[PDB]
Amino acid sequence: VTPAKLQQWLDERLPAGLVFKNMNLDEPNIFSLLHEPNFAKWVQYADDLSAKSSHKESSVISTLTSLHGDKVVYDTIQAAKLYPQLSELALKLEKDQIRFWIATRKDPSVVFEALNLNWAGISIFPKPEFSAWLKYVDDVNARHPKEAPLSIIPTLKQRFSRGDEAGTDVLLKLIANGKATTEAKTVANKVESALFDFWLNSRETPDKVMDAFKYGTTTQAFLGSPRWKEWERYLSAYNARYPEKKATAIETLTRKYGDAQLLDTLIGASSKGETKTLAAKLQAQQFDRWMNLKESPLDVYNRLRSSYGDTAFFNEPQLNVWVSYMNVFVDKNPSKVDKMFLELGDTFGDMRLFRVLGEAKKFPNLESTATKLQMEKASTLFASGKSPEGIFKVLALDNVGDDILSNTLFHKWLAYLQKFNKEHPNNQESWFDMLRISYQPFGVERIIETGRKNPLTRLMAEKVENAYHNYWLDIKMEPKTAFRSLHLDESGEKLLADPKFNTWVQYLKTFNDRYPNEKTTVIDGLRDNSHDIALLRMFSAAKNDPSTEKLATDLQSALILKWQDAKKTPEELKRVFVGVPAADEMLDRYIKLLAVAS
Amino acid sequence: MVNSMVERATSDMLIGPDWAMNIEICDICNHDPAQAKDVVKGIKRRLGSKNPKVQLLALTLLETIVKNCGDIVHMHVAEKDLLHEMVKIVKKKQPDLHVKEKVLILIDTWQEAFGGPRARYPQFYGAYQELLRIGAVF
């Protein structure tokens, strides 16, 4: 129908969409539509209408998006750019679509989708379309200052993972590596700022927000990471916006996890190099809280019993940290230190108190008064005349560790043992047995190593070393077994040079003296633990050391004697050796001995 | 005449509301109150469609003209018992949930906007109170 009918309709102010349908512009294919010359006339109509309608923006776009949805329109316009005679229209249409979107406050997700930001994944930031997408967001907010502002962030989260925290993890990763490259760094900072603003405007607490930064990792690992500082930066930002709800890290941590788990984590973190520094800092702050709450050490114990570490309170490490709080507490309350320990004393069993006091002696503020009561209690126990076994346990000597031989209590306990043993000649007790039982073989072994290294303990350590070997005699440990017990199997080529080798020889002798019926030679002991070819590799090596040369030669002979006892043929030996150090020397010698025997 | 505009503006062929067309309709309703009568009468008919999509489009148009155009249209809307039909949509045993939500929000908006029982079109409040008696909540 005619331009006249159009002008009539324009005077009548007919809606664009109706005119479209009047024109039968219901083409079967959207990509075809723009090729019809009729469509262009309708555009002109729609524009001219818009000039006197209420809406500025392109009714065309409104119409088309309402039929087909935003992406399809945009893609169609992009398809239209191809045919150059449509280019001028297509570029007008693109501009119009943007104007339209901005005017209609269309959701950023639709623009993101329409832009085919489907692709980018890793490389969202450098791509110009993404930049344009941020421009769109800023522009929309600029046109709409009255309304609550719109944000990118939901679109990003919902795309990369279907989980509030989990999606945010990938975003954080992307921000971090974006900052590292100069190229993306500017973009990365804008994205970060938007994410921050999003959290602030949604009023998402630091507590909640932390779960995002923590995602993927153990609690421990998060603290070691860069992300920790990033979350502190959030906390500080949160406090700035909402100072009535201000919170510090430790306070926040406390309310999230509770003091017990926090403490456990601070323990864990204090052990490891990456975290150690701040573990201690945060620990001190946790103490400062309890101090500001005026909680006595026993009050603190009350608090913390009621979830995690009561069963695992008295053991290492938890105890040590408790004692650390005690140290601080008395630094603020020197007056009541006596009263404190006294209350511990009536509340708990003596052995528990002893366990405390051992640790307390490490801390200068406590050392004196701790030492006093330690001795007062000990003296009482000595006066009782009870069994050394019992007394040992009450003194918590089982929990001193490797350096027990330095420990004043242990020495006092020995003195009691000797007195007791004289006074109970029918019912004597063994110091060594107590040590053996309580610290187990491997602990005894470390204790010896430690006590040897300190000259003050050295003589005592030798006594213990003797007693351990005496125990080996009493249990009839075979020298073969003793060799492995002293890890001589590890010493390699240098076994004869090993100091402990000599000790093992001397044990083997002593064993033979106690048990002549099952008497065993050094060479048999060596043969039990290793085969000939390793042994003569060790002997050929040992001949190079003057201190062991003679020994090596004696053992070469002793080995040869065993071949004779074993009635081995030189051919068997020659066959089984190949390219072996000292083999021919030893063969020729064995051959010579065989000749003399024959 | 005007019915064509309404029908096309509420055609099942649209995926979404043609907001520009809706505004264009608002403009002519501000020019010609006679045509405005016909518009609201058309909307009632299209609300009568089974198709929830059509219903939503009609509701959305209606929202638009109500906010944009003058007191004549408000009078028509009340006087043509359009509101009663809207109530009746909610009264269905299994209504469409989006439709239901839309009508509820609209009627709540309007009865507030017009001043409730002392509204010069108290029909809005009347419809809202009927809803309340059935125990609807926005």
Author numbering:
A (entry chain A): 78 to 675
B (entry chain C): 1 to 138
Pull text from the paper.
We previously reported that the potato late blight pathogen, *Phytophthora infestans* deploys an effector AVRcap1b which can also suppress immune signaling and cell death mediated by NbNRC2 and NbNRC3. The 678 amino acid effector AVRcap1b is a core *P. infestans* effector in the RXLR-LWY family. NbTOL9a belongs to the Target of Myb 1-like (TOL) family of proteins, which are presumed to function as ubiquitinated cargo adaptors in the endosomal sorting complex required for transport (ESCRT) vesicle trafficking pathway. We found that AVRcap1b suppresses immunity by bridging the activated form of the helper NLR NbNRC2 and the host ESCRT pathway protein NbTOL9a.
